Amino acid sequence: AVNEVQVVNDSSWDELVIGSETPVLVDFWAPWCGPCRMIAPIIDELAKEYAGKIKCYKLNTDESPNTATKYGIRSIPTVLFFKNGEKKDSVIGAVPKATLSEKVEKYI
């Protein structure tokens, strides 16, 4: 693994989530627990399966100065996708990526 977004801090909410040439998907983890729902290739693999131009990654746990400074992921891991910092969609735990994707398929 060398490419793809993931644990960057700032860079994300810097010009990525608001400058991404394609609709990416930001996965949460919530500090509720260390090994807590961190990440998984299931979201990524299926994030491009419907094409390949789509993006996705997990928020940085090192401190997450961005979201925390705004969104605020102190816990309750949710799933939101963006393609230009317009907050495409979002889905908190309890059938997150499922509830939304279910309505459509994934991102569109």
From Swiss-Prot:
One of its GO terms (cellular component) is chloroplast. The active site is at residues 33, 36. The record marks 27 as: Deprotonates C-terminal active site Cys. The record marks 34-35 as: Contributes to redox potential value. Keywords: Chloroplast, Disulfide bond, Electron transport, Plastid, Redox-active center, Transit peptide, Transport. GO terms for molecular function: enzyme activator activity; protein-disulfide reductase activity. It is found in: Plastid, Chloroplast. Its main location: plastid. Disulfide bonds join 33-36. Residues 1-108 form the Thioredoxin domain. The keyword Lyase does not apply. Forms a complex with heterodimeric ferredoxin-thioredoxin reductase (FTR) and ferredoxin. Belongs to the thioredoxin family. Plant M-type subfamily. Participates in various redox reactions through the reversible oxidation of the active center dithiol to a disulfide. The M form is known to activate NADP-malate dehydrogenase. This is Thioredoxin M-type, chloroplastic. The lineage of its organism: Eukaryota, Viridiplantae, Streptophyta, Embryophyta, Tracheophyta. The chain holds residues 65 to 172 of 172 of the full protein.
